[model samples]
Target: KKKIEYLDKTYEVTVPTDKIAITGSVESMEDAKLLDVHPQGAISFSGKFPDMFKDITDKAEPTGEKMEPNIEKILEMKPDVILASTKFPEKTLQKISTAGTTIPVSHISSNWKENMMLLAQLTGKEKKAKKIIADYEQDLKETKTKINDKAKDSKALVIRIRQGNIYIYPEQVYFNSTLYGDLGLKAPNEVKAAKAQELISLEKLSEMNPDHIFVQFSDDENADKPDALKDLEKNPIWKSLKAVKEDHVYVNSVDPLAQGGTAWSKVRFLKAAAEKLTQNK
Candidate 1:
């Protein structure tokens, strides 16, 4: 075993790893896939995205939610490495630690690249990881240039419809990195000043009036009204926004449940956004 420092903490792990257990959300599982490593155990969310994980979902079982996972099920998997998220509760993480060499991965947007690299290091897949990083960097650079040229001075914003309410994250959270950071697009003043997943009224959003809007709505997160996006679209204030008027509003551009802060999400979103912005009027 070798010791490596991750997230400012030392971890001991075996190289050329096998039998990983993904105990967290889409972010953690996507990192495993990017490294071409299939987890021995995955959460129920994996099963839902069969096209993404394929056969891995058959092996995945419900281990509770991302915040709280089932300990007995994890132990049964007997994995050598357990990949989880930093959002797990202290006690939940402690229980998971008993199963394997637990590595609680970060979910922050800025750490996406480092997070994937950390997983690749554990599994000795640095070569593949580097290639993925390089490809993404190239794509990002090209996309940035394209969007800047095609949609000059355009303001892009991503908002989530949860429980029939509109929510926006800070500049560094969610898809904001791709929109404002990598893509070199402008963000509305409200999005730039947002410090959390703050709820904003339709009137307020119209006031900000982004030029392009990406709306993310998941049924599970909006069980109160699965048609919340439709309802919002029909609102007078929502229709009054510049994005809607210009036909620049995108709905669930990627998987609605996707962790926008992950490398996987960024890659997919960058492609989708570029196509929409450059190819469309």
Candidate 2:
């Protein structure tokens, strides 16, 4: 048995091959593949992989689709390992296990920090993982300091505009709140009323009229395009807002929230927030 040290865990390298199978969905599967880990070490067979789409969509509400593995297709590949997550359904695991393909199964949590550490451990790159986490924390701390200096007193609103409705994000929802907390910014009273999933009205938003408004649209190109801001600028109510008047209304990348939140996504959030807040001040 071979062993790899990661985050203080000595995981036995039970599967050694150029083509190991990744049974579950992970955010950085592409990155892992880029490093020449295998022919396809991270294969995503689940359509409901939340992290995979989190870059394209934020705070996804599962449709409760029971994902069943295509046993014949998977068995054809003859994989050495099966990477699964806690988020994967129990029924799926049972079915897969019952099939009698005795591949090693590994689990990771939903937390980004934990996921990073776990991936490092699994891939035998513990030192690189530690450095990545260290760098992320350092940047996060510096951004927090910047936010304290600039947006400490500001009341902001983070919302997603989709299909003509606004979905207000709560601090408890992870990335949205993490970003706010890092900047020392507070969510407006109106935003706090909504919980995990709330559909808010434009009238309510106009009434709240926060000091800063950060809007994330569903489309990536639209979110990044200047014309997108111009379109919002044309809205009478949006134009009337104090934030808009003060030029505090801004857009963000759809990738961070649409796809599962990754280190790059977190950095993008901080970078956009810092630039906008600095200019606004």
Candidate 3:
């Protein structure tokens, strides 16, 4: 049993570690692994059974888009607790019920730590979950300190190029929040005011004078060999960008960043951000 505060309320829940349903996403899988909550292979649903979670998710089937587990499948699992996203389709959440006292737990949150604590409460791993968060927080602090000591004063721009559309992360959302907010890097004024990921033209892209620019591609294959990688040096528009000329563009996949605002992604981004910020300047 554990008491965790969530959404301005205190929740006292009895955890059943073995029979838990998780339809959140890959990040949730990371939390479960850290907590060691599914040693018995009783996890209900996952986004995909990556090797790290192979033991936990092997018995569980993956769900549909956004990791929405089917109602029938969830019912069959007879999970003692339901840990899933409310962002899923209305049809599926309609069937997944709250704890009627027996299972004693149900939760909804996309924020990684919130979900982790909720999962921990049910699985009796709050200590482990809290430690995981604390460790990452300390890691972030150390990374920031390292960057401040060894890196140059730099600005970063994170954007996505998918299907010929240039998606700019102008505002602090999942994609650029850690880079621009927690790391205290400034974005190009062109994008800093954007309230959301807005599509931009080539001219808009070239307007920025960023010290470091990050490029993300949606597809896994192209993440390694993004569209302009080959033609960047030859492309007039690309070469015109200040970051391009200065060789300050950081390109990578690292998967979780694609989803944005996830635990692993944020931690991974911090590590990568330090690596980029302190790179042999």
Candidate 4:
């Protein structure tokens, strides 16, 4: 029996490594994907799955705007276990728990290690998962040294442009840990003070004036204005930033939808960040 943490409570249940149903966002299925466990199906935002999801085929069904799973479709899979999101409401959790053993994975970035360990135990891939974690730690240390030597006293920051708006996350959320914590890059005060995806005006961004910038923009998130980044480039205030003038802004450096907090996301992004920082000089 495996004792799994779901939201605020923990329940001991039989761990089913076969025919798992992923009812959360694509990020929630990353651990299982890493372990080579084929899910029965999962929630798809655009009916398109990543290359890493080659084994899944068309098993993914459309999701609600907020990525709520379709209960009817999930039941069709007749899964042995349902991996859900901690962000789900209580009612949604109750409805899906009736279908199979439900394990709610946290959306918070800090809990990534625990979440990975839990999934590893469930899938009998603890050894592989541990190796992945160890490799990431090793890479992180080496990359940090390279970046510090290259960047020196220069500041760096990452921002996302969504729906024609600029946003930044808190220090502990998403890939901020990889940027500000693991890589040991300097964060401007605005990025440091954010508690969530806090939107900042161009004026505010210029005030911080980071030396290096990573811009993450996705057509899916900015469909209404896919030219948002291009438009921002023309702004007088945007043109004044050091990153802009020096051409240090790296856009879509990683996949737009890459879940920054997961092992797969972290490993891919760490490599990309190191190369960009060290090779550009």
TM-score top scorer: 1
lDDT of 2: 0.53
Candidate 2, 194-223: lDDT as tens digits: 555477776777888888877776443233
Give the better candidate number (2 or 4) by TM-score: 4
Give one digit per residue, the lDDT tens place, for model 3 in 67-147: 445556666666655555544555555556532212212222135577677667777677887888898889888888778
lDDT of 2 at 57: 27
Best by lDDT: 1
Regions of model 1 farther than 4 Å from truth: 46-49, 148-150, 279-281
> In candidate 3, where is summed lDDT lowest over 10 consecutive residues?
100-109
The CA lDDT at 85 in model 2 is 36
Candidate 4, overall lDDT?
0.75
Q: Which structure is stronger by lDDT: 1 or 4?
A: 1
**Every candidate's CA RMSD:** 2.4, 7.7, 5.1, 2.7
User: For residues 1-281, what per-residue lDDT tens digits would candidate 4 score against the true structure?
Assistant: 67766446776656746566777645656776676766666666455666766665345444333356778777767776777877788899888888777777776677777778777766677898898788888988877767747574678888889899998887877777787777777677887788777898888989988898889988878889999999999999999999999989998888777767788778877888887778443
Range of the 10 consecutive residues with the lowest summed lDDT in candidate 2: 57-66
lDDT of 3 at 55: 60
Model 3: lDDT of residue 51: 64
